[PDB]
Structure formats: structure tokens, C-alpha cells
Motif scaffolding. Structure first.
Motif, short mmCIF file in Angstrom:
data_model
loop_
_atom_site.label_atom_id
_atom_site.label_comp_id
_atom_site.label_asym_id
_atom_site.label_seq_id
_atom_site.Cartn_x
_atom_site.Cartn_y
_atom_site.Cartn_z
N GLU A 1 0.72 -1.23 0.07
CA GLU A 1 0.04 0.14 -0.13
C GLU A 1 0.83 1.21 -0.14
O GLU A 1 1.70 1.44 0.83
N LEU A 2 0.52 2.19 -0.76
CA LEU A 2 1.45 3.41 -1.16
C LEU A 2 0.11 4.50 -1.31
O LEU A 2 -0.16 4.53 -2.53
N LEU A 3 -0.07 5.33 -0.51
CA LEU A 3 -1.10 6.40 -0.90
C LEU A 3 -0.53 7.47 -1.81
O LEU A 3 0.79 8.02 -1.54
N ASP A 4 -1.27 7.69 -2.82
CA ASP A 4 -0.87 8.73 -3.85
C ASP A 4 -1.70 9.97 -3.73
O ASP A 4 -3.01 9.85 -3.08
N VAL A 5 -1.48 11.23 -4.30
CA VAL A 5 -2.13 12.31 -4.31
C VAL A 5 -2.01 12.84 -5.85
O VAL A 5 -0.91 13.06 -6.53
N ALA B 1 -1.52 2.44 -5.47
CA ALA B 1 -1.04 1.41 -4.94
C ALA B 1 0.27 0.64 -5.65
O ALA B 1 0.41 0.93 -6.90
N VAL B 2 1.17 0.01 -4.95
CA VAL B 2 2.21 -0.35 -5.68
C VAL B 2 2.36 -1.84 -5.54
O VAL B 2 1.83 -2.51 -4.62
N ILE B 3 2.50 -2.52 -6.87
CA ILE B 3 2.07 -3.98 -7.07
C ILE B 3 3.51 -4.81 -7.30
O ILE B 3 4.56 -3.99 -7.45
N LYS B 4 3.67 -5.94 -6.87
CA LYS B 4 4.95 -6.76 -7.00
C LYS B 4 4.36 -8.09 -7.50
O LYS B 4 3.68 -8.78 -6.53
N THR B 5 4.75 -8.62 -8.64
CA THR B 5 4.29 -9.93 -8.99
C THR B 5 5.34 -11.12 -8.36
O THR B 5 6.19 -10.67 -7.93
N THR C 1 7.44 -5.25 -11.42
CA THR C 1 6.70 -4.33 -11.02
C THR C 1 5.80 -3.56 -11.71
O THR C 1 6.45 -3.35 -12.68
N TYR C 2 4.80 -3.19 -11.53
CA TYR C 2 3.68 -2.50 -12.56
C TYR C 2 3.28 -1.34 -11.82
O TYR C 2 3.52 -1.16 -10.78
N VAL D 1 -16.22 -3.13 -3.10
CA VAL D 1 -16.18 -2.62 -1.82
C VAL D 1 -15.44 -3.19 -0.87
O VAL D 1 -15.22 -4.62 -0.71
N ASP D 2 -14.34 -2.59 -0.35
CA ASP D 2 -13.26 -3.31 0.48
C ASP D 2 -13.50 -2.79 2.00
O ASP D 2 -13.58 -1.74 2.40
N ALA D 3 -13.30 -3.84 2.97
CA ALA D 3 -13.54 -3.65 4.36
C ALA D 3 -12.19 -3.91 4.95
O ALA D 3 -11.69 -3.36 5.68
N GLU D 4 -11.49 -5.44 4.95
CA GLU D 4 -10.67 -5.69 5.42
C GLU D 4 -9.33 -5.49 4.40
O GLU D 4 -8.15 -6.11 4.79
N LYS D 5 -9.56 -4.98 3.45
CA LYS D 5 -8.49 -4.78 2.17
C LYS D 5 -7.67 -3.50 2.59
O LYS D 5 -7.74 -3.00 3.62
N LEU D 6 -6.91 -3.18 1.49
CA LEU D 6 -5.82 -2.24 1.59
C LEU D 6 -4.95 -2.41 2.55
O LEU D 6 -4.04 -1.26 2.84
N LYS D 7 -4.52 -3.41 3.19
CA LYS D 7 -3.41 -3.90 3.86
C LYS D 7 -2.43 -4.61 3.11
O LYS D 7 -2.65 -5.10 2.06
N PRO D 8 -1.02 -4.32 3.36
CA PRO D 8 -0.09 -4.88 2.49
C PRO D 8 0.11 -6.30 2.71
O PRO D 8 0.94 -6.76 3.65
N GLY D 9 -0.78 -7.22 2.12
CA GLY D 9 -0.78 -8.30 1.98
C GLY D 9 -0.68 -9.21 0.76
O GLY D 9 0.08 -8.56 -0.32
N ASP D 10 -0.60 -10.43 0.77
CA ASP D 10 -0.50 -11.35 -0.59
C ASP D 10 -1.96 -12.06 -0.91
O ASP D 10 -2.80 -11.88 -0.38
N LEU D 11 -1.67 -12.67 -1.83
CA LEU D 11 -2.80 -13.66 -2.42
C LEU D 11 -3.96 -12.92 -2.87
O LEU D 11 -5.07 -13.01 -2.19
N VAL D 12 -3.89 -12.09 -3.84
CA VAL D 12 -5.06 -11.25 -4.35
C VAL D 12 -5.37 -11.64 -5.41
O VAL D 12 -4.59 -12.49 -6.18
N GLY D 13 -6.54 -11.02 -6.17
CA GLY D 13 -6.96 -11.29 -7.58
C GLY D 13 -6.30 -10.65 -8.39
O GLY D 13 -5.88 -9.57 -8.15
N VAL D 14 -5.99 -11.62 -9.61
CA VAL D 14 -5.17 -10.56 -10.91
C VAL D 14 -5.71 -11.54 -12.23
O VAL D 14 -5.99 -12.62 -12.00
#
Lengths: 339, 58, 86
Positions: free
Chosen positions: A43-47, A56-60, A65-66, A74-87
Motif C-alpha cells: 500500500e502506498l497512498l498517492d495524491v 498502490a504499488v504492486i509486486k508480481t 513491478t507494474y 467494496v473493501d472492508a479488510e483490504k488495503l493492507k500490505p498482504g498477498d494472495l490477491v485477485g489478478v
């Protein structure tokens, strides 16, 4: 009621919307079916200066890096620096985020884990937080390792093994990785039970700060105390600790989130040895001759593992003794056999 | 068992639709359908060309 | 050449049989299984993959960390395999 006659058109538009959402809501299954690979998210907040700033910053997994903004449903527990996401194949959008990775004590263990999940109504009615850390300390002989782990198996919940040498690794920086990992399974996964032991041996506070590994174990351990004292919402999986000696106790364990319910278990006298040994022999074939007096008295400086070994040695010679039921003198025979 | 010399007639309609469809040609597999009229055996003419919605299957 | 004569004459059906059994994705091994449809797989190239189970392989025959054949186009598991060092 002439003014309320326009509601029928509104209801027709609403049911028409529910009738028309079946297509664009139906393509979700064929477009978002399955992410074929796994990509790490940081997670990296931009302006941007709507035109709002969000990215956000992605790492495959293939070390590529893309660039992509924070998108999806709608995200509730998301936005955390985790793995195993949809792509998807090449769109690289986020669609589905998934986490990657018995008798003498029944009151304090079962309550301290059920009340912070089931008694939330009394928590809102009274405004009181439950205790978190319990310290099953005292002199050895009680068998807090095998009996506390066996009772943790009797809790019927998830159990995760965590010991002293488990957190202590050969390399540095891995302790916080296994703390955030124990909080990944425990804090991120379903509520589990974690029981550690021998906390006093790693809670040494020396004066000469030149050579002491136990103070790096106090960097990971006091980092966990930073993640408990610093993190107020400790309603999730707790930290259950226990020590076999009261020689060097950490004075910084005085907090509701920390080890508060410090229950003192004394030397296993005839009563306590009859308790833990009545647990150890509550199901096996016990003959009506075991008075537990001499054998419970001879169990001096013998932990629950050594006493379980005494029970095994009692389970050794009774085959050739001829009797199919364990006798009285076989316990003390096992005691005098191991020592 | 017979074969002739066929030749595909391509106008600007299908060409420009393949240019816009190429601009919208994401790496995801896409679908399209061509139309026309059969006047004889060895000639073919395309007039109508449209795009199809993409899918996860491709 | 004598061994390649009978098989060379028996190589005609290899063209009509070349279309099936073509699935080969480096025999990537799985890690665990959180849910029954979606299975987490890890290839030897340090790339974690996820795909749903096919209809040709039963879910009860899947073992934790088992090397099985997997498609490289449909990404599904076509057929498993039993595997030898000294």
C-alpha cells in the motif's frame, strides 16, 4: 391519494433495475472467475493534485513491478500490505483479496477465550474489556506444557504450536516475521490458540549490554509488547504464556492486554499431584488400590513429561506382571526406574 | 472435388473497424464477426463488421 | 535403425494422437488448500499460481505437495502421475 400515485412508476423503475442487473452482474462470474497467478500488494497512498489521489504499488511473483491504482469492489479488510490477491491475465486489477498464511482448570482457560467473542453484549452494557494474558507460572511438576497443550486441544478451537526455539532463529529480523506471521494466522485467520512456554529464560534483563541474546529476544518479545500495548484493539487472539520458574520475571508485563491473570500454581503436593495425575489417569484402567500417597509423594522435581514417562514405565512391566490392569506399586516402580 | 481462385474483397469499413478494434485490442482474447453476401463461388465481399464483448475464457 | 523401423512405420497415428496429452506446465506442485474450488499452486520458477480443479481429477485424490500434470492453456489438472532416485 392522488399524489401517492407516482410511487408505482418508481417501483417499476426499481424492479426494472433488478431485472436489468442480471447481465452485468452475471458477467462477474465469467470475468472474475479465478486469478491464475499470485501477486504481492504494497500500500502506498498517492495524491493527484473528483480527481482524487489513490494508488498502490504492486509486486508480481516473477519479480516484475507494474503500476495500478486501488480498484475493485467494496473493501472492508483490504488495503493492507498482504498477498494472495485477485489478478487477471494482463489487466492486473484487484478483484478478490485472500489471506495467504482438563479437570483442575476449565474455568480460566475457556472463559478468557469465549467471553471476548460471545459476551460482547455485557461488554457494551458495562464498558469493560476482558483480560488477555494469562501466566501459568510456578514451580515445575504441574506439567503446564503437556497439560496446557492438552487443554488447548480440549478448547475445540484451532491450535498453533509456538515455542521458544520457534521464534529464535539463526538469522536476524525473522522474529518479527514470525510475530506478524502468528498474527497472520491468528489475527488474520480464524481465532486460534497459541501457547508458549519458558518465558522467564528469555526475559533476562542484564546490566552489561554487550553480549546477551535474550535482549534480542526482548527486542522481538518487547516488539510483541509494542504490538499489544501500542495496539489497543486486542479483542482478537490473545497471547498465553507460562514459565517454569520465578527467578527472572519481566516487570513490564503489567497490563490488561499483557499477562494480567498471573495464577500461581505451587509445588504439586498430594492434592495437586492427585489433580494433574487424576487427569493423567482419568481414562486408563486404574485398579481400586492406587492410594496415590506414596507414588504422589515420590514425584519430586518431576515435570509432566517425566511423570508421563513414569506412566509409560508403569505401562511397560505390567505386560509381564500378568495383571491386565495397572497396579499401585507400578507407579513408584516407574519413579525408581527413571531415577 | 473442385477448387477455384478465390479473393477476399476488403473495403474501408472492415479496415477501419479493425483499426478501432485494434486500438481496443487489449491483450485479452477478443471476438468478432464478419458479414457479407455470396454472389458467386470464387468471390467474397465483406460489408458489415462489429465487435463482441470480451470474456475471461477468451 | 532396425528398432526405428517398426516404430517409424507405427509413427503415423502419432500425428492424430499429438493433439491430446500435450499438457505440460513444468509439473508445478501445490502448497495447501484453503477451499475446495480454488487451489494454491507454486511453480519451480518461484511463481505462485491459483486455478480451479478440473472434472477429470477427483478432489479426494489430491495430496498436499503432490507433483501432478497440469495444462498450460486451460491451466486445469488433466491427469495426475504417481512419481526415482537411487
Amino acid at each position: 391519494k392522488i399524489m401517492k400515485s407516482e410511487v408505482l412508476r418508481v417501483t417499476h423503475e426499481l424492479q426494472a433495475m433488478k431485472d436489468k442487473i442480471k447481465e452485468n452482474s452475471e458477467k462477474i462470474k465469467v470475468n472474475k472467475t479465478l486469478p491464475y497467478l499470485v501477486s504481492n500488494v504494497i500500500e502506498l497512498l498517492d495524491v493527484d493534485p473528483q480527481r482524487k489521489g489513490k494508488c498502490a504499488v504492486i509486486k508480481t511473483s516473477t519479480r516484475q513491478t507494474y503500476f495500478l491504482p486501488v480498484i475493485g469492489l467494496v473493501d472492508a479488510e483490504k488495503l493492507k500490505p498482504g498477498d494472495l490477491v485477485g489478478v487477471n491475465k494482463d489487466s492486473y486489477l484487484i478483484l478478490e483479496t485472500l489471506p495467504t498464511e482438563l479437570d483442575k482448570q476449565i474455568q480460566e482457560l475457556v472463559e478468557a477465550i469465549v467471553l471476548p467473542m460471545n459476551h460482547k453484549e455485557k461488554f457494551e452494557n458495562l464498558g469493560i474489556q476482558p483480560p488477555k494474558g494469562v501466566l501459568m507460572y510456578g514451580p515445575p511438576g504441574t506439567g503446564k506444557t503437556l497439560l496446557a497443550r492438552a487443554c488447548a486441544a480440549q478448547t475445540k478451537a484451532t491450535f498453533l504450536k509456538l515455542a521458544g526455539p520457534q521464534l529464535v532463529q539463526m538469522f536476524i529480523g525473522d522474529g518479527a516475521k514470525l510475530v506478524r506471521d502468528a498474527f497472520a494466522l491468528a489475527k488474520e485467520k480464524a481465532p486460534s490458540i497459541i501457547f508458549i512456554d519458558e518465558l522467564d529464560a528469555i526475559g533476562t534483563k542484564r546490566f552489561d549490554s554487550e553480549k546477551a541474546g535474550d535482549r534480542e529476544v526482548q527486542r522481538t518479545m518487547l516488539e510483541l509488547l509494542n504490538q499489544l500495548d501500542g495496539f489497543q484493539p486486542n479483542t482478537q487472539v490473545k497471547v498465553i504464556a507460562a514459565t517454569n520458574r520465578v527467578d527472572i520475571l519481566d516487570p513490564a508485563l503489567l497490563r490488561s492486554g499483557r499477562l494480567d491473570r498471573k495464577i500461581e500454581f505451587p509445588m504439586p503436593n498430594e492434592e495437586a499431584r492427585a489433580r494433574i495425575m487424576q487427569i493423567h489417569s482419568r481414562k486408563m484402567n486404574v485398579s481400586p488400590d492406587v492410594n496415590y500417597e506414596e507414588l504422589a509423594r515420590c514425584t519430586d522435581d518431576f515435570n509432566g513429561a517425566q511423570c508421563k514417562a513414569v506412566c509409560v514405565e508403569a505401562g511397560m512391566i505390567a505386560l509381564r506382571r500378568g495383571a491386565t490392569e495397572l497396579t499401585h506399586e507400578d507407579y513408584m516402580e516407574g519413579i525408581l526406574e527413571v531415577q | 472435388a473442385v477448387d477455384t481462385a478465390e479473393q477476399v474483397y476488403i473495403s474501408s469499413l472492415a479496415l477501419l473497424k479493425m483499426l478501432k478494434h485494434g486500438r481496443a485490442g487489449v491483450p485479452m482474447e477478443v471476438m468478432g464477426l464478419m458479414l457479407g453476401e455470396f454472389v458467386d463461388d470464387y468471390t467474397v465481399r465483406v460489408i458489415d463488421v462489429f465487435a463482441m464483448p470480451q470474456s475471461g475464457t477468451g | 535403425a532396425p528398432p526405428a523401423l517398426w516404430d517409424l512405420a507405427a509413427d503415423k497415428q502419432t500425428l492424430q494422437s499429438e493433439q491430446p496429452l500435450q499438457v505440460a506446465r513444468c509439473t508445478k506442485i501445490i502448497n495447501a488448500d484453503s477451499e475446495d474450488p480454488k487451489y494454491i499452486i507454486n511453480v519451480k520458477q518461484f511463481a505462485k499460481f491459483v486455478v480451479d480443479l478440473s472434472d477429470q481429477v477427483a478432489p479426494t485424490d489430491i495430496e498436499e505437495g503432490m507433483r501432478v500434470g497440469v495444462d498450460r492453456n486451460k491451466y486445469q489438472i488433466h491427469i495426475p502421475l504417481p512419481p526415482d532416485p537411487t
